[PDB]
Symmetry: D3
Subunit: 243 residues, 6 copies
């Protein structure tokens, strides 16, 4: 049972038929692959590949991560499901896999996070640098991100060293989870939270579960659960629930 994988294979076959100049891209990336994991690792490694460190090295490293962490198989599928559930602009499971840099960046972080805890700090920093340049997402490898994360549009995401994001969170573009203290100094974003475009959340503060942070908000103090905050500085302007 892997309904997502078989959906993705069917989409890739139709796409190839529908546009056969894309067949090298679709066969290499989806159709020739033995699994969804290897198709995701392959695509991300090809986007991050560079003369400095080949796609192959990245792909091979990704594989060793997947072997030290077989639960990523589940997390990964939950992440794809998040996009499929939450983004109306895209209708296929194949879309975050092939196209969506936010999805690419999340799994890249998962790689660099694992590497970083292994003492492989340069590899992790390399991935961090490459993701920042190619996906425009600067996430410190020490950062903790939950499963079912939705990073929509993504451009300009900054996430600090001691930041934590829990499960089922949605983050848009232009968001900072940063400082400025110099110990634990970055936000903790509890489960189900939505963070709107351009929001700045600064300091070791907490954003309560199910809360919403309106676009352009500057959040300088903890936000309770089930509320909506907005503005510079952010004040409560509404109530909400984990919908």
């Amino acid at each position: 049972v892997d309904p997502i994988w078989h959906s993705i294979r069917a989409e890739a076959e139709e796409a190839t038929r529908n546009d056969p100049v894309l067949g090298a891209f679709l066969y290499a990336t989806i159709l020739n692959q033995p699994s969804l994991e290897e198709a995701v690792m392959h695509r991300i490694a090809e986007r991050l590949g560079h003369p400095d460190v080949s796609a192959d090295i990245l792909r091979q490293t990704f594989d060793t991560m997947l072997e030290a962490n077989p639960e990523w198989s589940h997390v990964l599928r939950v992440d794809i499901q998040a996009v499929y559930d939450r983004d109306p602009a895209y209708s296929r499971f194949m879309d975050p896999v092939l196209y969506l840099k936010g999805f690419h960046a999340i799994q890249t972080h998962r790689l660099a996070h694992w590497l970083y805890k292994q003492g492989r700090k340069d590899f992790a920093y390399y991935l961090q640098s490459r993701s920042s340049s190619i996906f425009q997402t600067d996430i410190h490898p020490a950062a903790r991100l939950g499963s079912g994360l939705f990073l929509d549009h993504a451009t300009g995401l900054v996430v600090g060293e001691t930041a934590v994001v829990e499960d089922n969170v949605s983050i848009l573009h232009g968001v900072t989870l940063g400082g400025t203290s110099s110990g634990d100094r970055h936000p903790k974003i509890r489960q189900g939270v939505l963070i709107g475009a351009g929001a700045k959340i600064l300091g070791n503060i907490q954003v309560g579960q199910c809360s919403k942070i309106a676009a352009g908000s500057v959040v300088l103090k903890s936000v309770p659960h089930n509320v909506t905050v907005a503005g510079v500085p952010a004040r409560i302007i509404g109530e909400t629930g984990c919908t």
Copy 2:
């Protein structure tokens, strides 16, 4: 008669004499080209090319768009003329064609939009994905952008699926024409002709910005803006009257 082409040709010629190391780039992109259209498609294809999908296939596919849409020839030139007229930092028609990712992003979108309407949705998504990563401009292929569009600096632009931008619009970096977050069906802004949108501005929801209006940098616009006004702030308020360029 094509004064934009011939002036770009003479700009490239001087640039090569001035800096001979750039001769391969200037000849391949401009001087060896038979037309402005071909030069523009070449430059863009080269910026977007990747081992996943070669610049050649992008270039070839661009040309199929120009065949099916000859009016792109005119749209291309008014988009160049917009940069020439509105940006004081550059003085040559060649500058947007060679260097400015905003201009490249616009034409990329026009290709993707055409492809999307033809049912070639993976090709359109691929271009949108590549434009987002390379030009930092995330424009859904279903979005509708008019001619005379000036995308200045560009970085961080997001334009939603149901957005419409009319003619002679100018948009700065860090601009979102997006949704509130509910949110389905027509849920993205309508930007009427002559509008200027300042840096970092967020315009959210199926709301309209009336013709010839100006949105100051950093504004968060949640309700419709009438024509002929300037709005600023979080949330936006009308601060002044204003007119078209």
Copy 3:
């Protein structure tokens, strides 16, 4: 003696020991290089290198800039020292040289700026274009940037043609030093020691006085006195501060 360069070589040697698969990257960019300058020029050239204009051409041109501006040797070391002193997420001098695109964007501008003063505007604009696309930093070649500059995270930086930034300034991502809405000199002057918060927009022919701090998300449309903190849309003075 060049303790910064000698620490980097040591950091890179241990790095390859620790992770040998990165040996090609680390030997090519650091250990094989005769100097810190050539390691920095080489990394930047590899990042910006493209079929259109090769890394080799970029690297060669960088060396000519170095040859013509000996003082860059000193400026480069103060910029590195700044990341080391001011950023708690990184512990090695090698970090900005290898990974930090803000650092790479600054030295890229110093090259484009020099080129642009030589009349080599196309080479200048090509660098500007590439840096805007690869490092997400759009700095006009005519802008002036002082030494000890720290560009943290960098993504979305926009710096206009007439902008001036003095020594020892720190600038976060999403910053605009731009204009609104004119003709000539229309861009800000950021005096020494200033800190500019994430997302902050500083527009027009205005100045931010020495040691001042602009908070995250501030929109600054009037000149800011020395030794203050400003915040808000639009910004107002919310405090007093000094240099460090």
Copy 4:
């Protein structure tokens, strides 16, 4: 009508259907191309392309050669027909166009040869160098090669600066059309119409190989060869009579 072209397009269509992963290669090289000329020029540019001199610059230059030498359209097709008639290992018109380096090298020579005449000697020598490295054919740009030329397998062919090859010749791999002692002047072979040159044959000096004759494999030819003979051995000696076909 251009029957060769139309056959090639149909063959490329079937090929893509039979093995879709080859679709990018087959579309970019054949199906997206507007003419046979452009398909051939494109494939060759891609094979020769390098970071030193991009495929694009090679492809643009080639197109410049075609404009100044409209005769090439014909030469190209008779070269292709030569392969289709003389090689039993291949059944399709597109085989030479996509795959056969001997064919690629002849058309590279034609480009180099024209450049050379134009005083563009670096570009000529660059192609010669790249062809020698990638197709293993070293042909001096000053060499003259006729049409209906068949370079079968090709590896290790060397053709001297003053060599001439007439129409309808077939040359195998390992063939030297080379020099003898030193000497500076006219010093390489003139090969007349219809000659077949066997594998590994060495033909040295300003000597002539007459109309319709056959050099067997491994022959060392140091003296002129009459028309309508077959020669063989070291030193090459006549062994039979032969004619054209």
Copy 5:
């Protein structure tokens, strides 16, 4: 129990410690690989990879042939064993896997041969074209090559469509197993077990070279050669007796 595999890993580890700049190459090609088969496929795919057809697609296609053809695992190791035993210039099992183009060209043909039989003739001919350009070995995908084949130096190898090379054969560079002889049908040589073919030798026509025989460098062979002889000369003459060993 894969003593070849285990020695190769150990050679790669030592080589990386000895020359750390080669670490990316040796990790990616050896030490990050799960098997000898995947390392050999990877190396070959990287050497033949091109923007026309990526290394990735080659590697994926290779892995498919391994799947459908489990026999190759054995043929591969008797090939590698052939090199270790027969070449005095190289001391490691890692050497053919990484460096030796003759070894690469052999395994490449085995892929192309399989594809050709599946009806994927274009992919077979692309591999043939690419091998001929990069390894200088032109082997028709319909040629039948036995196990334990040693191709030493390789440059200039040409093997016709109807050729058959039996097991335990050694072939030097510059060798042709070719035709006369565009007669169509069965028209290329049949080389029997244990044969040694010297540099430069040309074997032409549907003829046979019998077991354990030795063809001296430069020989031109136009008629069947019996078992257990050494032939030499242009034309080739039996000059002696020889045993297998």
Copy 6:
């Protein structure tokens, strides 16, 4: 003074004005370079560069060789002078530096030879493997080559582990300095000074070719040759007197 270098710079300058599209190539390879050494190292590294092992790593390793072997500065110049003096087909000192794979193969070998002597055997074999594939010259890094070596056309050169080539030797394409089949230690030829070796010639065994002698094209040399003679044939016989220069 360094007249070779100055002449190359002037040639380069002239070439770029003659053909501006080649400016990126000619600046990056010659005009932007501070020495002849660095120009030659750069060209070779760019031809040999691959995703497996970047041109930068090769170029940096070549620098290391130069740092330890300042003597190569002279060896390099006399190698360039050999081409200028001996090849009537090219009139500029720049020609071998840019174009001639035989000259590139020589300096590649000198690097590989030095690495091999340092115990960096894998880097040495990789260079040997790459040169074989890209220049078609298979030279074992343990071979000793003197200065003033002219490798004309080069395709198919094979030089064995224990071969020695003394100064001012000229070797054509298709040449083997190899072994016979009774191999142990020294099993490859010794070519003394001033020898000319003709195209396709095979010199097999631990035999010696004496001073100023000439080996005619196609020859198979199986026993030692005294000084001041020409040999020819299969196998080769002394056919006259000669004397070199």
